Design a protein around this nucleic acid. Sequence first.
DNA 1: CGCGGGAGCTATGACCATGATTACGAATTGC
DNA 2: GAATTAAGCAATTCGTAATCATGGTCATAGCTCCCGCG
Lengths: 69, 57, 65, 57, 218, 437, 1006
Amino acid sequence: RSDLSDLKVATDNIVKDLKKIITRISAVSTVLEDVQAAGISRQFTSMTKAITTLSDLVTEGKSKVVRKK
Amino acid sequence: SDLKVATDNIVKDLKKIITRISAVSTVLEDVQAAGISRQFTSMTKAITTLSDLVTEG
Amino acid sequence: LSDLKVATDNIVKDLKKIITRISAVSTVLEDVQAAGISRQFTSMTKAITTLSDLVTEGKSKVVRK
Amino acid sequence: SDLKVATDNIVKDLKKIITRISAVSTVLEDVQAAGISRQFTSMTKAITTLSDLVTEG
Amino acid sequence: MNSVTISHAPYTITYHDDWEPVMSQLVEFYNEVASWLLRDETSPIPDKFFIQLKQPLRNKRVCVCGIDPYPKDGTGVPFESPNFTKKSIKEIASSISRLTGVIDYKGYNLNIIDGVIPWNYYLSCKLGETKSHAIYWDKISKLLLQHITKHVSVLYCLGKTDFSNIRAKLESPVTTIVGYHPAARDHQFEKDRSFEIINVLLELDNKTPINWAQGFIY
Amino acid sequence: MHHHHHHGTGSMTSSADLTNLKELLSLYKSLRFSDSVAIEKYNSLVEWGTSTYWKIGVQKVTNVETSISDYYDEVKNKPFNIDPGYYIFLPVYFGSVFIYSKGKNMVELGSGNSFQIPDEIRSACNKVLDSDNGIDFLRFVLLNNRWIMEDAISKYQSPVNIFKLASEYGLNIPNYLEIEIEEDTLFDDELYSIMERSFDDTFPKISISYIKLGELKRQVVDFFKFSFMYIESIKVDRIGDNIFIPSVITKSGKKILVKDVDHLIRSKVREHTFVKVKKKNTFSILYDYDGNGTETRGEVIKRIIDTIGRDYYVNGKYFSKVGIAGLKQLTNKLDINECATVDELVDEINKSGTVKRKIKNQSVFDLSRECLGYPEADFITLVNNMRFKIENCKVVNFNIENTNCLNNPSIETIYGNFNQFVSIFNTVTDVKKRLFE
Amino acid sequence: MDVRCINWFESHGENRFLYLKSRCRNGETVFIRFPHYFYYVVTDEIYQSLSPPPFNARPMGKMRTIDIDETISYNLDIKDRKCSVADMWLIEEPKKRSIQNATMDEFFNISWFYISNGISPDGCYSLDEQYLTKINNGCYHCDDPRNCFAKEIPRFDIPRSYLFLDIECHFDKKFPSVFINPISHTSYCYIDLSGKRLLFTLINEEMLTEQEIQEAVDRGCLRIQSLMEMDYERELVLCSEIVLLRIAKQLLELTFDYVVTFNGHNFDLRYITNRLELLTGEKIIFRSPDKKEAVHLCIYERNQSSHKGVCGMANTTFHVNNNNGTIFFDLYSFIQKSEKLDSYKLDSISKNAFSCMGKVLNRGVREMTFIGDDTTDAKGKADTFAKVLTTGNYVTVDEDIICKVIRKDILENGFKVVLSCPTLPNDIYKLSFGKDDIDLAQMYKDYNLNIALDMARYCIHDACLCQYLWEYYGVETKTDAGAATYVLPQSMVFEYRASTIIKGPLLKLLLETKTILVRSETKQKFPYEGGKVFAPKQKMFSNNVLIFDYNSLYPNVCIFGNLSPETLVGVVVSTNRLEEEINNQLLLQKYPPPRYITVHCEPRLPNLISEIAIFDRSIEGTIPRLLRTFLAERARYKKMLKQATSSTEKAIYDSMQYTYKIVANSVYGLMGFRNSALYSYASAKSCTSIGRRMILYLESVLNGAELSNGMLRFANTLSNPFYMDDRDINPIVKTSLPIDYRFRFRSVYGDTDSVFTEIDSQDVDKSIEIAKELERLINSRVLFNNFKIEFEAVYKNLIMQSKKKYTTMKYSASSNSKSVPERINKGTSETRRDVSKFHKNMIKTYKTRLSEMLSEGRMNSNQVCIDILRSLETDLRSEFDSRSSPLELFMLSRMHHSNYKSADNPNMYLVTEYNKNNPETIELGERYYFAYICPANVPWTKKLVNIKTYETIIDRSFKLGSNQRIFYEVYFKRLTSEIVNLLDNKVLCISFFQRMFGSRPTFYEA
DNA sequence: CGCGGGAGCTATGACCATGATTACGAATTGC
DNA sequence: GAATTAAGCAATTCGTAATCATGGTCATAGCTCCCGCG
């Protein structure tokens, strides 16, 4: 917000912050693999809805930044 | 419901990320489009592995 | 088991997955602490202390001397 | 109800790893022993950081 | 610069390096037309048939094409008259003097101008006859003018009836000007401004305009 | 039958075809400068040249990029030392760049379309071109309904006396200052700021062009900083009787100037998103960049109208208003005094000979289209997709046939205002009936 | 003094004179010299404003001058057309005079001589000898062509003189050169004023040895040494080449009515005059009838530049600069202009022309006897074949086998000839005069006296073949018909295209109607829409298809709509629909539908949405009165053809009605042509629009037409589309047919002027009777004013590949079911000249096989697709492996021109490489045989790159080398594409085309 | 213990090759 | 020496060349860990 003389520092911020949230989501990936290997019974329909919402959000993010010319 | 609120604040923080990249994404350069398309495709590979791991088990 | 190369390769490649998973546990715990929900970490502290005792015993028993 | 059984499975896998290192440890030889010792320094650094995150409140 | 053998009376054709790709066919046609051509007393000297082959074609950008040499006292260079008794070169000198304003001239020569190759279509004519050796020089003229129009940019033809078929006589499209003959009646060569058109068409092809005052002989 | 030639050739050696070829050469040398009409004339004349002389050095053109950058040079954003000598300084203005070449139409840079200009500006430009033949073109700037001559690029003469003549026939000009220098003064930001201050024009300038006395290929010099300011809203401002300018507004309140509607929509300005601007000392100037979003042309126009308001439509370079429209809009487009009915209007048109001649020459549909300020091709596209019920040259009932035109929101806004268009068109048919029948 | 006009011709410079070659009843040739003037038309005030007085000025009466300018109007405030009636004068000028504002300057001075003096160029005239001033023997001067050429006596027969010739030249290379190769043979057909048809051939004695010369003398061929010893009565005469060329010069200097030679101006007469300048220096001197001027024979190359695209040079015709009145006629140029054949050399022209059916009565081991008469072929075809066989030497049998004639007997109504032919099974074969199975270069290489006499026979066959092609095409009757109709000199009839041949009768029309058409503004460019070609609704028809063709549709369109440039009231255009509806309402009120017709056309500009042209029908214009004159005179000459008994008068009237048909069809095309004197973009576009509307109207009434209970029910209301008409609009129409007929009519296809109606019946005679009923019912009720359809044919098993491409059998109105089917092929590969004869033959046989499956019954297309693909696969592999079919069957053709947008077109470069390498010069408009040639060492190729670089032009001297081969793969690709376009299912066809050539085949979409 | 050198995986945009699409022009017929 | 003509478009097929879908390959940034030297 306000004024940015160069955008590129905020671009470095969003690259590092999105790297952080990739580390979070890989962490929950390989600990959900851990609790699946533990053998406890779970119901992950709400997780399926949550990753469907996440997929819709990341396709909305990718639909207007990926293709040039 | 620890994973529920975990996926909840990942959804919230990622939606904040989507809003700020929507604010800045009108004016992105070419090598920026290349790098952030690479980074986004890595993240969608991560959620594809998530979908496979929670579908197969 | 001859020349102990396969056993050393196994105990190198497994502990990288182990440190990846315990860094994942720390990362998701930081995430759920940043959620704002109140949580209690008594049994987690007990498990962390006993695995710290076991890994210090392993470090004392793995010395080359 | 899931992180405690996750770290319980971590403790069980570490028990298996510790028992097999104790089985092979009649001979180790110095370079891989020093490598495993530096891996154990990384182990206790990760454990120290997670202990800080559970004692910070 | 280059020479090839000829079985007939000129016995030698001197040509420039850019005149090379038509010379085998020109010798082939001349070796069948010359045995019948050299019976008639030609208005140019038979050793002066191919003077214009000694001129390069890359520096030329416009070609002034006549249908034949002058029927009397043929120099062998088209529109060249040291005596300056020919009416056609007098009208060329009059039109270029109307272009430049230079009225104090002794004679005119289209050969000495940079970028201008004066050309006779039929390279020879009989003494006192017009278009006499047309059947001898037909395919030779088609070949040589096709080479010129492959090289030069603008073709200027000094005849309306004579050069009416000039698009048929040339296989490649070239900027062609079928102008009026200088000796034509009703003063149509006095009326037209074809050398101005030559200059304008050369600046349309991004070429250097012709200094027409170079051709005056003082 | 050789009284008819073997293959007859025309009088292409004559002086009339010489003058036609010289016109071809002069129009080819100004091919990028000319409009579409002179480009079509050039294509027809190249076709004539191929028909007569069997080959022409130039070729027929289909699309020509309208750029006068051959008479300009690459712009620099660094401070630079200047050579000693005489220098004339002309400001370069923010608005859309237009040129008035020798084809007597108003050529637009980047598209080549001929723009419609008022009659007094057209007459002043014609008098300027007829007074001095050596002018290649007249560079103009369109912003806020003011046609101002940014520069007058010519080969032989200076633009100073040309600008003096443009002041004489009524064309608006910037202040010209002939300031000479002695040493190699570094043209920094402070000297540029004091030069813009000494220009003393309230109109927005983007850069400064310095003019040599005897040297062509003139240079523009621009100092700016690329900035990215967050956007609060897009607000419209009144610059005419009916039309509006876009003006995009930040959180702090700094007014970022927008060149036109096409400049706003080609950069894809979205609410609460960052934009690329050229930061100046006083004003804020939006950069001439292209947006990188996936949103299409019709959808970005639709959302810009939806943010501004559904009673707005795109009219060329400027937005416009719809509403009630009676006799006063026809009055102000007829530049005469106010009317209450048809009878006083037709009597004072009978008093005004020039207004009556303009009514006679212009068609009724064109007059009623210019009354409400409609775009030309967009309104033709709207009318060409719908049917009418007509009695005595009056649209007593109209219905729309093709719904597919209504996805464009400008067409939908003109269709909403078509009732007022029908009322004004019935008024102008009544006027043309009581004058010439 | 009774004369009949032979030719009109002008003096070659100096004093400009116009001469008339004319023939009396006793056969004495009469020359009349006229002072040829530059005629100009000015008004009265311009005529008095002339500072130099005119040489002559005849009062032309009050003639209206109308400004024919197509100015578009965006409203109905249209100013009236600028009609200015003034006294007008014919400014006859001996020299060319530039007169400001002089009207009617588009017309020829020869046409102005014709119309103003009342002279028809094909007319018999009783001359008043007081106006004739004698110059010398046989030549007169007429200073007053009005009163002298006033009595038009009817036509009388004349003894026309002729010189049909052809020459042979020696050659060791591909083509002879003039300077190094002597002339071997000059044959002539000397038809003089007495009718004594002399066929004599000159033998070159310099190509024979002395003992060979005396052997030729002992064989009966007399030998001469000069001109005075020459006798035209003996058929074979030996001489030196100088004496031969002096005989040629003496014959060409004779004032024949027609010297006719096939490819003669380009090759034969040019070679004669050039070799005459070579060996002796003499010149063929053409002298004027008054003998003031004398010109030499110089073949001037006349090139016809095209008018489309780059306007490049399209055709080249060669002519003779004679001023003695002889119509030096090149048959090569004439049949190039008229006929559409693959090659225009004399062998193919004689093969197409003189084709006859010959039955076999006697068969031998090598001598096979053919008999042709009126039973074998049509009437007059066998007599024509006997006439050609009188001097003929070789007969081509069944398009493939060329046979030398051993003995020829001329019957009373046919021919009897034995042929050097193998024994053949069938009884009836096609006999034609095709190619000649000799190798003329080797035949000249080993040249002896038997060779000399055989090519003397071939040379006299070619010289008489000029006569047989002259009489076959009716060129004297077509010449007289073009002279009378186009109002041109008889030499000028075929040498001019549509604009000059319309400028004569338009001049007639403008002087009867007292009308002047002027164009003050420049003529700008628009494209427009032509006729509406409908999509064929079914690709195949097992049922009969009725052909209802309009009787000269676009002339009836112009006469009906008054579509002339001056009757155009205005062009109403609209950029928007609202102005379009305002203009529609104001067109309904302002211009009433009976007096004015509103033609809704396409927009001429992309911003316009409508364009309506208004035509005043209170008085008729130039185009309708000209076309009414053309159609009335064509009907009149067809009526006199019906009341003619002699074959000569029948030929004259048939050529008259044909020439009027050609000029009436030409009036359409000259309205759309920008530079024509008939140009009117609004009238031409309205002509196409009204003709399209009539096509839609006739298709719409015939779509779903049901003939039930002896009553015809049209589906749509029988309304005149242009205006409300007084005639009945009831669609249910009484017939004159039996009640039991319950048949459905479906308009499946529609041409520019033809509507194809498919009746569900399959009986032929029933379809013909019902269709004649439909034709008369349509002409009585459906159509209106001058619009009449003529029923052309019943199409049995009509096979339509696409639009304008169909193959069918003809069952005409005169024909019946008992008559033999006649093959009409339109637009497909048999008429295509870019298609090899192998492709034509196989598409004919396979289309006949698919016609046979359609005639046998309803059976599935998958199995038939399979068996046609198997048979095609077998035939194409057998053709690729065996190569049994000859070079001629795989040989394409192309017309050479210079109308090319790209200068580096491989067609232009290919013909340039041929003319640069090979001694044969291909002119502009020449049709050259080409084939696809690659070296034989390459294998079978699936993919194709650089196909047009494989083009090589094939001539008569070309032989296929051992290392070279024909590229058969592109022939199989084109042929297989044409098979699979006819086939139904795409899936097997794409698989076959990919397994055979490895590409995706293009399929037509209906 | 802490960060640099280096080496290897790993997608990923830019670029090149191949083949299918389509405008584009000539040839040709039709009416 | 010069001197003018010159039929319209609809529609199909075949070859050529510019353009683009698809796919292979190659630099290339990320990026992640192994080893290491102080």
